[PDB]
Design a protein around this ligand. Structure first.
Ligand SMILES: *[C@@H]1O[C@H](CO)[C@@H](O[C@@H]2O[C@H](CO)[C@@H](O)[C@H](O)[C@H]2NC(C)=O)[C@H](O)[C@H]1NC(C)=O
Ligand SMILES: *[C@@H]1O[C@H](CO)[C@@H](O)[C@H](O)[C@H]1NC(C)=O
Ligand SMILES: *[C@@H]1O[C@H](CO)[C@@H](O)[C@H](O)[C@H]1NC(C)=O
Ligand SMILES: [Zn+2]
Ligand SMILES: [Zn+2]
Ligand SMILES: [Zn+2]
Ligand SMILES: [Zn+2]
Length: 264
């Protein structure tokens, strides 16, 4: 996800963290603001744009080597790779935030990374190798020449909401929260975190990856890529996927809240 998506996942998480957990994260982040998690949700993307951070680019995704749309599957040892992936990064930093030998700012870095990666994992193209996670699939959306990946990360979410300011993410999170507590997602919500255990970060994260990867075959490119490079994707393709985007942003937020609560 782009900026709006990351901030939204964070605001949703802020709603579900216990009051005690919310004070430990605020202490660790050195900020007691109303946007304590949301304001740093995109830090990892800014970091990879620096020479110091270039090494971390591969942590934002897992290139599942499957065969969409026929067969979608994730395999940790087959797909993670030599330079790490989102799954190994979840394990690394879950352990580092609560390590007593590390420094305060080592803890702040780990938390900032967790806030980000738990969200990135729900974007289906972040769990798929094909065409470089869809970046090579050139398409037309709303009259513009984008690529599949950027449409899922940024353009479709912004088409729905209308902007990427923190205030936009705050309002989107509000509707999502309503739906989880008293709406369409209420019955589903518990299944999003069922089984998640901080003492089993690899098994847990692989589960999150498989859940998102399955959508590549059924929703992202159910009829191959050639079917997507031929007309404008709005409104027909847009209409068929926008419900899934909201669902994935909500899962990220709910899972992040529960992860922080368990760690605390
Ligand atoms: C676990 O997290 C640490 C902290 O971010 C990673 O350490 C960085 O590793 C890169 C590449 O080796 C170095 O260039 C950085 O300078 C390191 N930073 C620090 C603060 O140590 C570490 O590589 C991560 N390990 C895994 C397996 O992902
Ligand atoms: C995709 O890439 C090539 C190069 O731009 C182009 O010839 C083809 O028509 C493209 N598809 C669209 C939708 O541009
Ligand atoms: C988490 O993992 C350990 C097993 O290693 C277990 O004792 C604990 O009950 C597990 N389940 C939850 C929900 O924490
Ligand atoms: Zn992202
Ligand atoms: Zn992306
Ligand atoms: Zn990212
Ligand atoms: Zn509530």
């Amino acid at each position: 996800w782009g900026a709006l998506g990351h901030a939204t996942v964070a605001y949703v998480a802020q709603h579900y963290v216990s009051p005690e957990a919310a004070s430990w994260a605020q202490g660790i982040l050195g900020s007691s603001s109303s946007s304590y998690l949301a304001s740093i949700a995109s830090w990892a993307d800014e970091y990879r744009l620096t020479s110091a951070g270039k090494w971390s680019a591969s942590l934002h995704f897992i290139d599942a080597e499957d065969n969409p749309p026929t067969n979608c599957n994730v395999d940790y040892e087959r797909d993670c790779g030599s330079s790490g992936c989102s799954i190994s990064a979840i394990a690394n930093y879950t352990q580092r935030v609560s390590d007593s030998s590390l420094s305060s700012e080592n803890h702040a870095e780990a938390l900032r990374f967790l806030v980000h990666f738990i969200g990135d994992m729900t974007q289906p193209l972040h769990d798929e190798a094909y065409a470089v996670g869809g970046n090579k699939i050139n398409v037309t959306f709303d009259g513009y020449h984008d690529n599949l990946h950027s449409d899922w990360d940024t353009y479709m979410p912004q088409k729905l909401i209308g902007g990427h300011a923190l205030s936009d993410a705050e309002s989107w999170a509000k509707t999502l929260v309503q739906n989880i507590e008293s709406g369409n997602y209420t019955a589903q919500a518990i299944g999003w975190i069922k089984g998640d255990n901080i003492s089993e970060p690899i098994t847990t994260a692989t589960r999150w990856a498989s859940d998102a990867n399955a959508l590549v075959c059924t929703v992202v490119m159910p009829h191959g890529a050639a079917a997507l490079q031929t007309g404008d994707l709005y409104p027909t393709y847009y209409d068929s996927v926008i419900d899934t985007i909201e669902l994935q942003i909500a899962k990220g937020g709910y899972r992040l809240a529960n992860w922080i609560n368990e760690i605390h």
